[PDB]
Amino acid sequence: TSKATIRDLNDPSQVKTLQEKAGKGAGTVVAVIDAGFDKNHEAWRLTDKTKARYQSKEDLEKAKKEHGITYGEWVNDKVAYYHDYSKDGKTAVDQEHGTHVSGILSGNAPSETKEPYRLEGAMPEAQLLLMRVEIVNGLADYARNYAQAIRDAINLGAKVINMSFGNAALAYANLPDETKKAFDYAKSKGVSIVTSAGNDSSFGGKTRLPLADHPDYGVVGTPAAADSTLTVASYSPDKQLTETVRVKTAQDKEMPVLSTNRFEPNKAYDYAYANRGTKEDDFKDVKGKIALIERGDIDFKDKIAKAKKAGAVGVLIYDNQDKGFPIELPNVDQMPAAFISRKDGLLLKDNPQKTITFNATPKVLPTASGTKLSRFSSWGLTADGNIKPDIAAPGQDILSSVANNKYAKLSGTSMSAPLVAGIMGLLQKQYETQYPDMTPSERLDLAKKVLMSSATALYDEDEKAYFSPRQQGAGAVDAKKASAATMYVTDKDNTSSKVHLNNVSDKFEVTVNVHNKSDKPQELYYQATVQTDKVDGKHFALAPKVLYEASWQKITIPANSSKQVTVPIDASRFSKDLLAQMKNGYFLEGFVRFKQDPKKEELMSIPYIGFRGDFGNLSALEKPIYDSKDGSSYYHEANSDAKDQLDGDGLQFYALKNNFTALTTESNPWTIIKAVKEGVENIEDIESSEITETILAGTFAKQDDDSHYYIHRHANGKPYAAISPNGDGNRDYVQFQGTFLRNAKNLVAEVLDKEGNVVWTSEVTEQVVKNYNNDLASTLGSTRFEKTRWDGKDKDGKVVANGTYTYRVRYTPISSGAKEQHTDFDVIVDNTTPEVATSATFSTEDRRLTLASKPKTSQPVYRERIAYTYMDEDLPTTEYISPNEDGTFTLPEEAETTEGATVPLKMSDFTYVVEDMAGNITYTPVTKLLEGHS
Ligand SMILES: [Ca+2]
Ligand code: NA
Structure with a gap:
């Protein structure tokens, strides 16, 4: 008959309440800028096309003509416009991501769908402008292309633009000028731009914790870093619509599963425990059964492959974390593989009857995580220190439209963003009636402020503290509270619903302006939390630590007016213990929470962030590997038995090992030197068994070569870096390699002669991005800077005299007013040929x-x-x-x-x-x- 929608069962952000007030988008246009789309998906439909802005291609072409747009095409009644801004791309178009994002914003699946429940996005009766952009020729070109998509979307009447894509850690300041102006143009027209925060967690990535010594661990990049956009983090609600399994315990019991490929529904499977699946003996009894496998030690795909080898018909992998998140398992040759929580896996492990049945239709069940920010969600701050993300929305295992008229669950801030975009669109519509005398820009500004103020500050039940505002922004969006709001809260300059204090001492004030748009005065109670980072040993835990809560104050705000409040903060008594954990300074942050009465629910909350220290001047560069006491660095583990072992690149294809700050040089063995000087053209694997190797300067093999290099140091402890600039390729040069903890600018190498003179200066590397991971899919743990290569010649092209020089690398943080930093290496130049026996x-x-x-x-x-x-x-x-x-x-x-x-x-x-x-x-x-x- 008529199928229920997903939202009918599962509406964590209370969108239905806003739809009751403001509609479902009929007559409105929204735009999605993403990597590609299934333009024919069954979800792209309107209930009544007569109410649409564009009722035909001719309507669209008229609007195209009025704005001089001479490209792009009408697709169907829902997809009023499509254009590919990256057609020079050589790669195939990916359709899954853009379709999935677009479905959350505006999917409107028919009842004829094959799915059990209809996908009905936030604005299911709006029309879509679908704009494809992809990186083809560099990041600046990419931003110019999506700037045009933004401008075209505005001029074709979009009220909201969703951008569920980004590139980690990039600075807003480095965007092309025309990209910056496109953001400003949207703001000036009242068009909301919503950006995903990113899925890079913090510096180090989702498998790592950042070091407590280095608090500037944000990885939000662009477009999110643009202040005018609304940037969305991901969290899990405490319940979610999920596929399920049924099991008989020591009574029936339903459990969430997240499945890759398909189990046979309503079939009783036998299962068998196979530990972590790290050896064959583990799978001795899984033949013809499902292998129950604990997460850990080895990859998921390895666990699944070995279970398939032992004859298993499917796999259940259970978390090794308490209160974890479902993880989408890899597709290994169509093997059915489902992820379950630790508590549910432990239950099955000790269950008497090892039989399990998969259900065909999903249902809402509690999540193992509870209410919890997604581990992948990108932390602020931005590169120049601004507060992002702005807000959070559900982004775990969201079911939406994918390619070829199908549906699938995906997790990401990419999924959180379009839900916020649809709430923004509907609230803007509400405000067209509620505040008709505002301009579109004024209504947009109000909508952003109300969404952030009314967002609910999420509470970490494990830590008994609110998640950091650098992780959740101003809190979890709530369309019911947003739609009902007649007040909002901003910083003292009325620019945004967040307070950025920059550097603070132990005592400071949090000032908030409380805005009352109702016709009646309103009384509120307010209280500030005071909190910082939790630290486990030498690492940030990426979890909050509450210091205290200030006493409740109250204020009455007259009708149609604003009133300023101030909350004094004094964290002085905590400073000794906090500095012991976070010696370079720490955040002092929290939320000012507003209520109609201290016993009632939170009505509004505004985040504030300061840094107890000198944030701008935190070291941007990880100290050189040579200076590590134990031979380790953030991305490199030492050989415990030989801390000075430091091998070169070898014949590796990717540079995943030995990512640290250092100088590179090259080892060229005599057989290759000789062959080149004799003019031998084809050397490798032909004329010699030896190889030219990129190695770290200051390292040397043993005379009886054991296949390893070792750091050698002057008596003063500095590495014995030395070059022979004679053009034979053997140790002719040094070149800077950096593990950057922070973005930087204007990186330049110079050489001092230690007598008072700069004798050589490199070309400048203008933009440096922090090494926020060590993974081919994102960024490597160190960067080799070719412009810094020093060939031992002075600024006139003359080899310098034999002697010791200072190779100095200078670089400046992004933060306003930061001092230039530098790191120095002694480098010996010596071109004296050995004098040796001639008989x-x-x-x-x-x-x-x-x-x-x-x-x-x-x-x-x-x-x-x-x-x-x-x-x-x-x-x-x-x-x-x-x-x-x-x-x-x-x-x-x-x-x-x-x-x-x-x-x-x-x-x-x-x-x-x-x-x-x-x-x-x-x-x-x-x-x-x-x-x-x-
Ligand atoms: Ca040489
Ligand atoms: Na809030």
Whole structure:
């Protein structure tokens, strides 16, 4: 018959209450800017097209003509306009994400749908403008393209623009000027722009906690960092519509599942516990059953693959966290795989009857998380220190429209944003009747303030404190409270419903202006929470710590007026213990919460954030790896048995290892140097078995090579960085590699001669983004800055004199007024070629080679060796002999191949190779030394 909608069962943000007041979007236009869409999805329909702004393609083309828009097309009655702003892209168009976002905003699935419940988004009777943008030619081009989409959406009549995309940590200041002006244009026209906060958690990413020493751990980027947009974080309500399983316990019992691929509904499956699935013995009894597997130790896909190997028909993976979130499991060759909570997995593990049934229709059940901010949701602050996100909305396991007329659950701030966008659109409609004498810009400003003020500050029940405003903004959107609101709260300058205090001492004041738009005076009680970061050892826990709550005050605000209040804060008695945990300073933040009576529910809340310290001047760069006491850094674990081991790149394709602050250089072995100087064109895997390797400056192999490099240091503890700028590719240069804890600007390298002169300056790297993860899917843990490469030459192109120089790297934080920072390395330049024996004698009896003289080098000797190069399956293969203690070398008679065959060695196979610590090198055939007699 007529199917219920999802919202009929499950409306965590109370959208129905606002729809009762303001409608469902008929006659309104909204826009979605995303990566691609299924433009034909069944969810794209209007109940009554006669009420639409655009009743035909001709209506659309008329509006296109009035604004000089000569591109884009009408699609159907719902999708009034589509344009692809990134058609020069070579990659295939991804349709899932944009369709899913658009469905939350404006899906209107028919009752003929195959799904059990109709997807009905927040503004299901609005028309859509669908604008595709994707990164093709860099981020500035990308922002110019979505700036045009914004401008076109405004001029085609969109009242709301949803942008569920972003690039982490980027500064607003670095956006193209035309992108900044597009945001301002939307604001000036009363068009709301809603942005997703991002799914990057904090510095370090969703698998890591940031270090307590480094409080500027925000990763919100652009477009979200634009102040005029409304930026949306993700949380889980304490209940959610979910697919379920049924089990008989020690009575029936229903449990939430999140399934990848499809179990057979209404089928009783047997299941068997397989521990964490880390060995084959784990799966000894899963054949023909579902494998119950605890999260941990290994990847999900590995657990699932091994269960499939053992004959399992499906997989249940249960969390190793208490109060966790469902995680969408990977699709491994269509294997049914469902994620369940720890409590439910432990229940099944010890359950007598190991049988389980999957239900075909979903139902609302409590979440394992309770009311809790999503672990993936991006934290503020922005790069220049502004407060983002602004607000939170449900973004866990949201069911919406995807490609090919299908539906699926996705999690992300991308899902939270379009729900807020639809609430914004409907509240703007309400205000067209409620405040008709306001301009569109005034109504938009009011709507943003009311949404943020009326948003409910979410409370962390585990920590007994409100989640940080740098995680939840002004709280969880509530369309019922928003629609009912006749008041709102702002900072003292009336610019936004949040208070940014910048740097504070232990005593400060939180000032709020309380705005009353009703015709009657109103009395409110208000109380400030005072809170900071919880710390576990050396890490932020990414959880709140309450310090205290101020005493309740009250105020009466006259009708159609505003009144300022001030809450004094004094955290002085906490400072000793807080500095012990957060030695470079810490946030002092919280919410001013307003009620009609202290015993009633929260009516409004406004977040405030200050930083007890000097935020702008926090170190932007992680200290060089060389200075680490234990050899570890944020993204690099030391070898516990050899803290000075520090290997180079090897033959790795991706640079996932050894991400830290350091200088790079290159090791070029003598066989490659020789081949290049002889003009050999095809070297690798052909002329030599040795490799050119990018390594860390100041590292050196042992003479008997164990395949590792080790830091060497001057007696003063600085790394022994040294270069030989003679153009052979062996240690010719140094180049800065940085793990940036904070964004920075105007990064430049220069060389001081330690006599008072700058002798060389690099080109400037204008924009530096913090290394907020160490993952190919986002960013690596360190960045190599090619512009800083120093070839040992001065500003006139002349190699500097042999000596020690300061290689200085300068960079400035983004924060207003921050001082320039710098990090210095001593670098030795020495181009003296080793002076070595030109003759030798050879004793056949004991096979000892005696050199006529010993090496004389400017820098200390690095290696003095005899190489032998022998054929191994058509490849000249080089191994090395170290000197005897009497200075001779014992030459072997044969070598052994990898496959085990004996290869006789000839005198012509041996080469004498001497190298110093700057990379200066000589290589002489042993046969030439033996001929060095008259
Ligand atoms: Ca060199
Ligand atoms: Na609020």
